[model samples]
Target: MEQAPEDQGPQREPYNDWTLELLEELKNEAVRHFPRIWLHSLGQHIYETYG
Candidate 1:
């Protein structure tokens, strides 16, 4: 007999949301303790984290 595809249960999509407020607070803390140039680095980090 020819093989056929098997039925599978529906899968929920992954949640892609992040708490902007917390990220804001973290950035602010970085600004306070770290140099301003680090903001650009942090941005890339956040991008990679979400990506």
Candidate 2:
């Protein structure tokens, strides 16, 4: 039988990690592009969700 690449695995944890990093980057980009309003709304949503 043949083997997969060293980077390949039975699960997709690596992909999930990359996705989360990309999400954070996009969130920061949105805030940068749309300053105070986007940032304020995000902060409010987080506070409401967590608190």
Candidate 3:
């Protein structure tokens, strides 16, 4: 399937790899967004997505 989530980008990887990205994004958005809530949000999403 085509990637609808632009943040997922053109790069594809396993779950852990996406976590690496998400952790950074979460941290980057911590100032404005809810950091705690962002945690664990991208797990299954990134997996089924990139898989």
| Runs in model 1 lying further than 4 Å from the true structure | 1-18, 35-51
Candidates 2 and 3 compared by TM-score, better number: 2
Tens digit of lDDT per residue, candidate 2, span 1-51?
232223564532324556467667767777687865767788888989795
Model 2, poorest ten-residue lDDT window? 1-10
Q: Against the true structure, what is every candidate's RMSD? A: 15.3, 8.8, 12.4
- Each prediction's TM-score against the native? 0.31, 0.35, 0.30
- Pick by TM-score: 1 or 2, better one: 2
**Stretches of candidate 3 above 4 Å error?**
1-15, 32-51
- lDDT value, candidate 3, whole model: 0.57
In terms of lDDT, which candidate is strongest? 2
What digit string (tens of lDDT, one per residue) describes model 3 on residues 1-51? 432243556653434655567766666777677653555466656766795
**lDDT: which is higher, 2 or 3?**
2
Candidate with best TM-score: 2
As for TM-score, the candidate ahead, 1 or 3, is 1
